[PDB]
Design a protein around this nucleic acid. Structure first.
Ligand SMILES: [Mg+2]
Length: 406
DNA sequence: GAGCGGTGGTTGGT
DNA sequence: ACCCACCACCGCTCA
């Protein structure tokens, strides 16, 4: 749930992660900070086949993509209140990313971190994050349109635009929507009441009123008999019809379920404060660590496996190295050859950069046993956001720019 | 989780 | 008695 929510709030803006990451880097002068709920992986990585551990392999490639986007991720795990959690946490550490355990539900924690300013957006499986206080919420990190290929885009929902759009649904309203019609995930919901009726009750204002009331029987019995009377007669015309068959359980509205949404179990103030000092971390990618991980987990063994790690990892490391920080510069970028504004990044300016993968990664395939091909000591080419390049290798970008103006 | 067509119930009107 | 539009719910499909 909430089932049919997108008919009411819109299915969302659809947008390149690159574009979000780079717009934010341009506006706020630092990389986008993203809370990712580790639940999004369950039905997404199971399609992967072949080789060893194809599910954690896809996680690996998504992490390399995050490096390329220059995004500081914090992956949030559910708390007590077939990819191992331990293996995921290890791979997260190796990549210099952050792992965080929610005390309860991860989506609630993700929204909380956003509210408290630890992250700028949440990436989650659905828009429940909005009932929990999220303002910018992303879902469905995946490829675009008829292209069954690389995952470049996400679906963005803005709690502010939704509240001021046709649905009227803000945090308060949705809350009512699922007390009244969330009879599968929650107790004492109204049988026969679905999204339409619940929604037009939210609009009438019943969700605002309910959220501003002590959890004070005298006033919660009042609200109920306004709502109940209004459903029966539609005197104010808040509905499209009368609803006399709609029978309301004695125990509705369950105030303990209201508690679960308005005051969800999240980290303590002390924990929020530790995250302010420690996130994002000052961590670099553990290269030797990842070499050992990929040997053990994917059987990327011996020289072929060393060369495979290098090819896959190097564009990522380049971007990451750029965002850290008469002047060398070349130790990252050998040259630039072209510029484009591609539909896949929603016209984010990119420069065609050259680099030496093995040099950049710092692994020598020769120290490992031998068993049109890819040579990691030849120059490789990658498109990299012009903005990132300007921060990281400014005089190379300048030199290319004059080259162009001639 | 989210989209889809069928279906069975409700409502308000023929 | 019955139609009709709307709706919530169900199982089924991609995950
Ligand atoms: Mg959810």
């Amino acid at each position: 749930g909430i089932k049919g929510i997108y008919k009411e709030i819109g299915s969302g803006e659809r947008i390149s992660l690159c574009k979000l990451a780079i717009d934010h880097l341009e506006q706020h002068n630092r990389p986008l900070r993203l809370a990712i709920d580790m639940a999004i992986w369950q039905f997404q990585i199971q399609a992967a086949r072949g080789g060893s551990n194809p599910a954690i392999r896809t996680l690996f490639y998504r992490f390399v993509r995050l490096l390329s986007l220059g995004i500081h991720p914090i992956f949030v795990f559910d708390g007590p209140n077939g990819v191992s959690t331990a293996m995921a946490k290890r791979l997260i550490r190796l990549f210099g990313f952050t792992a965080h355990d929610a005390p309860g539900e991860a989506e609630a924690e993700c929204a909380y971190l956003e509210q408290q300013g630890i992250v700028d957006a949440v990436l989650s499986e659905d828009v429940d994050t909005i009932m929990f206080g999220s303002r910018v919420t992303l879902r469905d990190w995946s490829s675009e349109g008829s292209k069954g290929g690389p995952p470049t885009h996400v679906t963005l929902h803005d709690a502010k635009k939704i509240a001021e759009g046709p649905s009227g649904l803000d945090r308060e309203g949705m809350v009512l929507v699922a007390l009244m019609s969330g009879g599968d995930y929650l107790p004492d919901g109204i049988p026969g009441c679905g999204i339409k009726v619940a929604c037009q009750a939210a609009k009438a204002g019943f969700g605002k009123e309910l959220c501003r009331i002590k959890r004070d029987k005298e006033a919660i019995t009042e609200w109920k008999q306004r709502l109940l009377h209004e459903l029966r007669t539609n005197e104010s015309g808040f509905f499209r019809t009368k609803h006399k068959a709609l029978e309301i359980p004695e125990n509705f509205p369950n105030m303990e379920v209201l508690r679960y949404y308005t005051h969800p179990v999240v980290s303590s103030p002390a924990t929020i404060e530790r995250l302010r000092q420690e996130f994002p971390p000052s961590s670099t990618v553990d290269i030797a660590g990842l070499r050992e991980f990929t040997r053990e987990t994917f059987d990327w063994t011996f020289r072929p496996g060393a060369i495979k790690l290098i090819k896959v990892l190097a564009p990522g490391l380049l971007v990451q190295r750029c965002l850290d920080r008469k002047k060398e510069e070349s130790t990252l970028v050998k040259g630039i050859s072209m510029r484009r504004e591609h539909f896949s990044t929603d016209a984010t300016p990119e420069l065609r950069v050259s680099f030496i993968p093995a040099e950049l990664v710092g692994l020598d395939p020769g120290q490992e046993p031998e068993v049109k091909p890819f040579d990691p000591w030849q120059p490789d080419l990658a498109w990299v956001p012009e903005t990132i390049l300007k921060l990281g290798v400014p005089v190379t970008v300048e030199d290319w720019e004059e080259g162009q103006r001639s």
